[PDB]
Design a protein around this ligand. Structure first.
Ligand SMILES: [Ca+2]
Ligand SMILES: [Ca+2]
Ligand SMILES: [Ca+2]
Ligand SMILES: [Ca+2]
Ligand SMILES: [Ca+2]
Ligand SMILES: [Ca+2]
Length: 409
């Protein structure tokens, strides 16, 4: 059994573009020998005949600096005379292909700017910025569709949008441009491209814009007061300072509040998933107002509260007692029924039953049964033991109750 010289081979990304594709064949030294990969590899699998097949679609952008798929292969070989189990290393060099589309990095989205009312021609107003994962990208900027009527133009390389013409812009009017960025070093004979984006240019002045079109957060019911839930941030287009406020529709306001200037949302009142009067989903409205101006804008903020196993199963009675039980009762007789309830939900409310005295047994329905003869070793004619109701929470909480069984002959 020997190490064989390393196999070196070269391919482009695209060659490995189809899951399961047999890209190439490993070299055999006799017909009879078979192949198996030495360890998992994310990019390739190996058939017993030597075929190297794509596992995960090959990706230059996701390989390390070496840009190789590097793996070992076991080669095995009765009736052939000489037996062995060989090792060979296999190194595929992966060449780049322009295969990933460009994407805008402008934030926030949608894209928004303002234009000064009497802006001279060629005033810069916005700067489109795209990025492209491929090594040899070639980003070109375009206005694909104009709804200003021709009052703007973009520089194809810098992505700067600037005014055209001398006419004034109208206060509060929106001027709309649909823009794209494309990578001209890659195609599909059609160039790789961002989705069309809507660039909103408003004359003179506009309301603030939040950094996200909406906000959401899922928090547990047991999370402490005054703790930070989510922080919200808006931008002014005239560099005014901003102050936030919050509302509800129409379930439980006062539960949350917001930081005056810093936008951080905190928990104000302790929560309870078990409290019906509080909802499980909190629909909130956050408005960012310019108190140095007048303008303001709203954004939805949704908070989901989750169940924690804060409740233990409770038995309906504090203790259970059965009387006049004949001791000769055949095994399997219902002696008494027991029941316990749990406030939580799902499996935090799922209930299993146990019994501390192996003379009895109990099923998922709480039926306490006779598990051994009751007439043997029972001088005082009486059993006293504990039932547990145990939930399926993590960790599980328990409820317990005394059970008394008085027997007789
Ligand atoms: Ca790729
Ligand atoms: Ca590529
Ligand atoms: Ca590209
Ligand atoms: Ca609770
Ligand atoms: Ca529980
Ligand atoms: Ca709970």
């Amino acid at each position: 059994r020997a190490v064989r010289p390393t196999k070196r081979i070269e391919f482009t990304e695209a060659d490995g573009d189809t899951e399961g594709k047999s890209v190439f064949q490993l070299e055999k030294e006799t017909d009879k020998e078979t192949f198996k990969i030495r360890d998992d590899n994310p990019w390739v699998t190996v058939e017993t005949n030597g075929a190297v097949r794509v596992k995960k679609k090959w990706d230059y952008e996701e390989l390390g600096p070496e840009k190789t798929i590097d793996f070992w292969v076991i080669i095995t070989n009765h009736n052939a005379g000489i037996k062995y189990t060989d090792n060979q290393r296999v190194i595929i060099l992966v060449k780049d292909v322009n295969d990933e589309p460009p994407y805008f990095i402008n934030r926030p989205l949608p894209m928004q700017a303002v234009v000064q009312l009497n802006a001279p021609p060629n005033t810069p107003v916005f700067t489109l910025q795209a990025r492209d994962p491929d090594t040899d990208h070639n980003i070109h900027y375009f206005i694909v569709r104009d709804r200003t009527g021709g009052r703007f133009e973009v520089d194809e390389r810098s992505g700067v949008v600037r005014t055209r013409g001398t006419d004034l812009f109208q206060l509060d009017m929106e001027y709309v441009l649909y823009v794209k960025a494309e990578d001209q070093n890659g195609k599909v004979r059609r160039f790789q491209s961002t989705p069309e984006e809507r660039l909103s240019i408003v004359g003179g002045k506009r309301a603030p814009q939040f950094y996200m079109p909406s906000y959401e957060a899922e928090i547990p019911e047991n999370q402490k007061k005054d703790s930070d839930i989510i922080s919200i941030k808006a931008k002014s287009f005239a560099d005014r300072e901003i102050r936030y406020t919050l509302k509800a529709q129409g379930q439980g306001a006062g539960t949350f509040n917001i930081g005056p200037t810093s936008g951080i949302v905190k928990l104000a009142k302790e929560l309870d998933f078990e409290d019906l009067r509080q909802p499980h989903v909190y629909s909130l409205i956050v408005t960012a107002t310019e108190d140095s101006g007048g303008f303001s804008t709203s954004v939805d903020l949704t908070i989901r509260v989750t169940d924690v196993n804060d409740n233990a199963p409770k038995f309906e009675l504090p203790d259970y007692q059965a009387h006049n039980v004949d001791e000769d009762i055949p095994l399997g007789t219902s002696i008494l029924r027991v029941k316990a309830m749990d406030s939580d939900s799902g499996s935090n409310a799922e209930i299993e039953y146990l019994v501390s005295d192996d003379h009895f047994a109990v099923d998922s329905n709480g039926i306490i049964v006779n598990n051994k003869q009751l007439d043997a070793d029972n001088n005082n004619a009486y059993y006293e033991f504990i039932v547990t109701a145990k939930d399926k929470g993590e960790p599980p909480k328990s409820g317990v109750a005394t059970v008394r069984v008085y027997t007789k002959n």
